[PDB]
């Protein structure tokens, strides 16, 4: 059975728990881990993890980036760099930053600058989608 472990650098949400399902967004498209998933190791993207406790409960945490590792013996390590529960986020401010980033996108001094800017657009769009 699973051995979930979902820890931010500051706080730790689950530590060697036993959950039913973990829906995680990764760089190569979202997916969902269950008891005996095939071993993998992906790198997250700004999205929202959804954990289903052993019972029917469900909880959402918005992860910004990190790494998910599904191990051979049904032990998931999901380390996010900054995992915040949805209630801590601001809807309007996310829209404001999305619009601002869309603004600065035009002043693409160099492809690296455009990359960072529209990574910002990507993350803010993920935020608004999560909060809408």
């Amino acid at each position: 059975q699973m051995s979930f472990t979902f820890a931010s650098p500051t706080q730790v949400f689950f530590n060697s728990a036993n959950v039913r399902q973990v829906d995680v967004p990764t760089q190569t498209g979202a997916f969902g881990i269950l008891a005996a998933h095939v071993p993998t190791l992906q790198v997250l993207r700004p999205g929202l993890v959804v954990v289903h406790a052993e019972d029917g409960t469900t909880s959402k945490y918005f992860v910004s980036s990190g790494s998910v590792t599904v191990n051979a013996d049904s032990s998931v390590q999901l380390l996010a760099e900054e995992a915040v529960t949805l209630d801590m986020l601001d809807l309007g401010a996310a829209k404001a930053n999305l619009e601002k980033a869309q603004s600065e996108l035009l002043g693409a001094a160099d492809e690296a600058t455009r990359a960072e800017i529209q990574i910002r657009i990507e993350a803010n769009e993920a935020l608004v989608k999560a909060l809408e």
Binding site: P9, R45, D90, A94, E116, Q118, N124, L127
Partner: protein
């Protein structure tokens, strides 16, 4: 191979930027606590 890797970035920079985008969109009070436990103070001495 994402675009930012086509532009020569690294996943550390991508994670930095995404974390910033998530941090500047918290309820106001939380932002204060987010200023702690975040943001570097290290300096690099050129060799």
């Amino acid at each position: 191979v994402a675009y930012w890797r086509q532009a020569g970035l690294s996943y550390i920079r991508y994670s930095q930027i995404c974390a910033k985008a998530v941090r500047d969109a918290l309820k106001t009070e939380f932002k204060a606590n987010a200023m702690k436990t975040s943001g570097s103070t290290i300096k690099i001495v050129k060799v």
